[PDB]
């Protein structure tokens, strides 16, 4: 209760999302017990990078950075709808617009949630909740992200990636040493593919759901249009079914969005989280290769008896640096497992509740309409 963080709103400006980060605190390190600041996705990436680069946090499970907000799909569909406004009825256009606004809102809510969960994880951690760059990004001296005018720094960072990317690509062709990092590795290796496959299948399912929802709106339009010219007895009956499909469209689009949030997004998260755990194993074993490199250096140094202590010391630190990474690695992998079980359990529970909510909502909608006609 001493540091509570929520993201009550966000604003999607052109190619950017701004999050209102709201903080409530009883900690005397902050100037106010309640305050709000504006933050962009890049500020969360910077906070995450700074926490990873902090040497004293090397033995802590740093929460994964939130995913970049992707609105390109919903925005492209919204633009194409505006170009097509003259080819359809005002009622069809209004319906299709509402379905796309609901798709956009579902992506927007998943984005806000992922950013809030990242900050809440930092606030819940006994060390990271006291981090100066965290406190500065929350209730510190306003915002200190893009305060420096020069881009020269950005150009230098981009170059590192072209050179940096090669080191990671080269590192893929390596053979595990000793007896550590064995069975578990291929497991993550195996789970990532199963996670990725279940993610694209989930995405296809929800996108088919929205397609079905779109039909409901288009169907209610033709029903309404059809009911115009007709004997009055059936004319009113048809308007009640068009009114029905207008509402059913609203729940189907809603079940697609909640489906995208609880399942597809849960799977997206741990597809990148698995990738992060794999980088931990890569670094741990890197030490191993370093410890071999060091011995081959001592073996020759002892023969000439020149720099024995120097190559001895080198061997000692890569032996035990490996153990230091090995401790923090296992401490974080286990941490990951525990967090993944809680996440799956949480989303599965929530999804089930939402599925039941919408199912009952449709039952009452269809029930009342059926009981209406049976009792004309």
């Amino acid at each position: 209760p001493s540091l509570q963080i929520d993201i009550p709103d966000a604003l999607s400006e052109r190619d950017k999302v701004k999050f209102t980060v709201h903080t409530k605190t009883t900690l005397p390190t902050f100037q106010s017990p309640e305050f709000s600041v504006t933050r962009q996705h890049e500020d969360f990436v910077w906070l995450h990078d700074t926490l990873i680069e902090t040497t004293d946090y090397a033995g802590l499970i740093i929460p994964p950075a939130p995913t970049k907000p992707d609105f390109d799909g919903p925005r492209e569909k919204m633009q194409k709808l505006g170009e097509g406004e003259g080819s359809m009825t005002k009622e069809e256009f209004a319906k299709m617009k509402q379905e796309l606004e609901a798709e956009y809102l579902a992506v927007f809510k998943k984005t806000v949630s992922s950013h809030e969960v990242f900050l809440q994880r930092l606030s819940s951690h006994p060390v990271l909740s006291k981090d100066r760059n965290f406190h500065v990004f929350l209730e510190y001296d306003q915002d200190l992200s893009v305060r420096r005018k020069n881009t020269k720094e950005m150009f230098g960072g981009f170059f590192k990636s072209v050179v940096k990317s090669a080191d990671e690509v080269l590192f893929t062709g390596v053979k595990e040493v000793d007896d550590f990092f064995e069975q578990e590795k291929n497991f993550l290796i195996n789970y990532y593919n199963r996670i990725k496959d279940s993610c694209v299948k989930a995405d296809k399912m929800t996108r088919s759901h929205k397609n079905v929802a779109d039909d409901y709106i288009h169907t209610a339009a033709c029903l309404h249009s059809l009911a115009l010219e007709e004997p009055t007895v059936i004319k009113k009956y048809l308007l009640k079914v068009a009114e029905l499909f207008e509402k059913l469209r609203k729940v189907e689009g809603r079940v697609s969005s909640d489906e995208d949030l609880k399942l597809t997004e849960l799977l997206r998260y741990y597809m990148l989280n698995i990738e992060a755990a794999k980088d931990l194993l890569y670094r741990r074993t890197k030490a191993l290769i370093d410890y071999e490199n060091s011995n081959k250096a001592l073996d020759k140094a002892r023969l000439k008896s020149k720099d024995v202590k120097l190559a001895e010391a080198h061997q000692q630190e890569c032996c035990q640096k490996f153990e230091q990474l090995s401790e923090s690695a296992k401490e974080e992998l286990i941490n990951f497992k525990r967090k993944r079980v809680a996440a799956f359990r949480k989303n599965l529970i929530e999804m089930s509740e939402l599925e039941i909510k919408h199912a009952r909502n449709n039952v009452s909608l269809l029930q009342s309409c059926i009981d209406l006609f049976k009792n004309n």
């Binding site: 604003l11 999607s12 052109r14 809102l105 927007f108």
Partner: peptide, 20 residues
């Protein structure tokens, strides 16, 4: 060219903001 949407928690509501 500059359609922006505001997402707010009071229950969440999304508002279109139209600025030419």
């Amino acid at each position: 060219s500059n359609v922006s949407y505001k997402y707010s928690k009071v229950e969440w509501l999304m508002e279109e903001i139209q600025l030419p």
